[PDB]
Design a protein around this ligand. Sequence first.
Ligand code: NA
Ligand code: NA
Length: 58
Amino acid sequence: TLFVALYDYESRTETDLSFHKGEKFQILNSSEGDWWEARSLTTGETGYIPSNYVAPVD
Ligand code: NA
Ligand code: NA
């Protein structure tokens, strides 16, 4: 399942990933907690994203 960003997000450190609304992600690990390691389909950049900022793609 790919996920899509609901809102813009400005990351705090190098651990979490900044992204824009509408960006899509491949999820790498979602079972450390509610922050998921993810890869942007736009940039291929990876980092943690807040799961409450994404939804599964149509
Ligand atoms: Na960051
Ligand atoms: Na969500």
